RNA sequence: UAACUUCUGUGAAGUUG
């Protein structure tokens, strides 16, 4: 496959899982807001986490909605980033696992989950293309290479 | 990379196009 087919097939696979990558700038800001809410160990319902993030992104990002931010939260959920507390007959509460309570750690797990989805879908994407896809530059090749090699 | 809505989702369904 050419780069364009790889990209389209990747986002199809991500979306098929109820997840979304919103673009490099917006995704970064969304993840920073998840941290802002959860880095201190607060236990939020999925609904309240999404509200926290959406409200802060809406001024800058017309893409921001409960739907689009929900997709980002789902990506982190699928990546096992949350300690989930079940409550009988009620909404579960979510905390960030202690190991993911910094941007570097959370972002790495996020990126690894998208690479994992690519692998699930049979897509072989170079570190160069990964850097472009997830960061909009070619400066994150070594980072993506590390993720690929640890997967 | 269809948008949105509901939902306790390693995910579902619905509305619109």
From Swiss-Prot:
Signal peptide: none annotated. Transmembrane segments: none annotated. Coiled coil: none annotated. Expressed in spleen, testis, ovary and small intestine. Residues 1-151 are annotated as: ROQ. It is found in: Cytoplasm, P-body. Post-transcriptional repressor of mRNAs containing a conserved stem loop motif, called constitutive decay element (CDE), which is often located in the 3'-UTR, as in HMGXB3, ICOS, IER3, NFKBID, NFKBIZ, PPP1R10, TNF and in many more mRNAs. Binds to CDE and promotes mRNA deadenylation and degradation. This process does not involve miRNAs. In follicular helper T (Tfh) cells, represses of ICOS and TNFRSF4 expression, thus preventing spontaneous Tfh cell differentiation, germinal center B-cell differentiation in the absence of immunization and autoimmunity. Interacts with EDC4. Interacts with CCR4-NOT deadenylase complex. Interacts with MAP3K5; the interaction is probably stimulus-dependent. The RING-type zinc finger is required for proper localization to stress granules, but not to P-bodies. This is Roquin-2.
């Amino acid at each position: 496959q050419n780069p364009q087919q790889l990209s389209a097939n990747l986002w199809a696979a991500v979306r098929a899982r109820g997840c979304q990558f919103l673009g490099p700038a917006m995704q970064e800001e969304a993840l920073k807001l998840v941290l802002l809410a959860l880095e201190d160990g607060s236990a939020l319902s999925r609904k309240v986490l999404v509200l926290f993030v959406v409200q802060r992104l809406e001024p800058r990002f017309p893409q921001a909605s409960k739907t689009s931010i929900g997709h980002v939260v789902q990506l982190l959920y699928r990546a096992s980033c949350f300690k989930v507390t079940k409550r009988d007959e009620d909404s579960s509460l979510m905390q960030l696992k202690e190991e993911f309570r910094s941007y570097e750690a959370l972002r790495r797990e996020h990126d690894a989950q998208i690479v994992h989805i690519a692998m699930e879908a049979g897509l072989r994407i170079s570190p160069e293309q990964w850097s472009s896809l997830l960061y909009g530059d070619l400066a994150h090749k070594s980072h993506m290479q590390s993720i690929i090699d640890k997967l």
